[PDB]
Amino acid sequence: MPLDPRVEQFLAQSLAEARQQFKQGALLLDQMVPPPPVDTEDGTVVTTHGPVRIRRYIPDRLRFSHPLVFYHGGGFVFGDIDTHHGLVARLCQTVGATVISVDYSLAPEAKFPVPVAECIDVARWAAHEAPGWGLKPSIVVAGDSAGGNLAAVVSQRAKDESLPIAAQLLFYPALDMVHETPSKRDFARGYLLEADAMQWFGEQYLRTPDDVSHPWASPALSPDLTGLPPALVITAEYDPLRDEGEAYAEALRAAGVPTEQIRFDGMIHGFMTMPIFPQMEAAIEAVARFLERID
Ligand SMILES: COC(=O)c1ccccc1C(=O)O
Ligand SMILES: COC(=O)c1ccccc1C(=O)O
Numbered sequence: 064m065p066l067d068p069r070v071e072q073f074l075a076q077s078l079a080e081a082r083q084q085f086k087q088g089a090l091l092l093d094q095m096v097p098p099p100p101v102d103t104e105d106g107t108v109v110t111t112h113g114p115v116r117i118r119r120y121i122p123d124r125l126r127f128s129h130p131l132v133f134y135h136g137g138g139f140v141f142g143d144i145d146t147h148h149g150l151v152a153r154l155c156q157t158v159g160a161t162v163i164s165v166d167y168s169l170a171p172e173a174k175f176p177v178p179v180a181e182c183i184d185v186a187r188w189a190a191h192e193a194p195g196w197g198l199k200p201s202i203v204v205a206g207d208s209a210g211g212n213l214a215a216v217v218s219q220r221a222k223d224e225s226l227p228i229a230a231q232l233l234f235y236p237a238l239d240m241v242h243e244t245p246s247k248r249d250f251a252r253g254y255l256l257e258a259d260a261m262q263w264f265g266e267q268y269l270r271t272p273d274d275v276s277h278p279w280a281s282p283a284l285s286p287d288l289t290g291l292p293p294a295l296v297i298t299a300e301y302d303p304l305r306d307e308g309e310a311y312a313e314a315l316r317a318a319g320v321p322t323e324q325i326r327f328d329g330m331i332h333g334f335m336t337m338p339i340f341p342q343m344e345a346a347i348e349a350v351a352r353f354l355e356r357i358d
C-alpha cells in the first residue's frame with residue numbers, strides 16, 4: 064500500500080529518437096531479467112488497412128485451448144513485438160498458450176481508428192486459424208494500457224463483427240479519454256505515465272479532439288456491457304488510469320459479465336513489462352489461474 068520498495072528505487076532512477084529510446088529501455092530491463100526461451104514464428108496478416116506484422120509464440124507444452132491475441136501498449140505511438148517480448152514469452156510459457164503478438168500501425172502515421180480495425184482483423188484471422196492449430200475457434204484478447212484499450216474495444220465489437228472471443232485480459236488499460244478520475248488527478252505526475260504524455264498521445268492518435276467521446280476510443284462509455292467476454296482487469300494502485308480500469312471492471316460485473324478485478328498495491332503503471340518487479344510474474348500467474356476458469 065506504501066509504494067513498493069523496488070518501484071521507489073526505480074522511479075528515483077524527435078519521434079524516431081523517442082521510439083528508439085523507449086525500445087532501448089525495454090531491452091535494458093530484459094537484459095537485467097532475461098525472458099524464458101520460447102519458440103516463435105513471424106508472419107504477416109492481411110488486414111483492411113494493410114499488412115500487419117505478427118509473432119506467434121508456441122509454448123513448450125500446450126495447456127490452454129484458445130489462442131491469445133496480444134496487443135502491445137505504448138500510447139498508440141510507441142512499442143513493438145520486441146518491447147513486449149518479456150511479457151508475451153512468459154504469458155506463453157506460464158499459461159501454456161499460443162500467443163499472437165501484434166504490431167498494429169502506430170500513430171501519428173496512422174490515426175484512430177485504424178489500429179482498432181487492424182486488431183479486429185487479426186483476431187478474426189486467429190479464430191479462423193485456431194482449428195488448424197488444434198485449438199478452439201474462440202480467442203482470448205489481451206493488452207497493456209493502449210493495448211488494453213484495443214483489447215476492450217475488440218471485445219465490445221466482437222458480436223457485431225461475428226468474432227468469437229472467449230475472454231478479455233486488460234492490463235492497466237486506458238478506457239476513458241473523456242473523464243478526469245481521482246487517480247488521473249492524484250497520480251498525474253511522477254509515476255512514469257504522466258498527464259502531459261497522455262495529452263500528447265491523444266494529439267498523435269486522435270483525428271480531432273471530439274474523437275475522445277467515440278466508443279471505439281473510449282469503451283468505458285458504452286451504455287450496455289451485457290454479454291461481453293469474461294474479463295480480467297488488472298490495475299496498479301499508483302496509476303492515473305487506475306480508477307477508469309476499476310470502474311470498468313465494476314460495470315462489467317454489474318452487467319453480469321464474469322469479471323476478476325485485481326489491484327496490485329504499491330505498484331505503478333507498466334509493471335507487467337518491468338521484470339525487475341516480482342509483481343509482473345505474480346500478475347502473469349493471475350492470468351493463468353483466471354484462464355483455468357474459462358471454458
Ligand atoms: C519491431 O518489430 C518486430 O520486432 C517484429 C517482429 C516480428 C514480426 C514483425 C516485426 C515488425 O517489424 O513489426
Ligand atoms: C501509457 O500506457 C501505454 O500504453 C504506454 C505509453 C508509453 C510507454 C509505454 C506504455 C506501456 O504501457 O508499455
Ligand SMILES: COC(=O)c1ccccc1C(=O)O
Pocket residue numbers: 137138139208209237238239240261262264265266268
Ligand atoms: C496510454 O494511452 C493513453 O494514455 C492515451 C493515448 C491516446 C489517447 C488517449 C489516452 C488516454 O487514456 O487519455
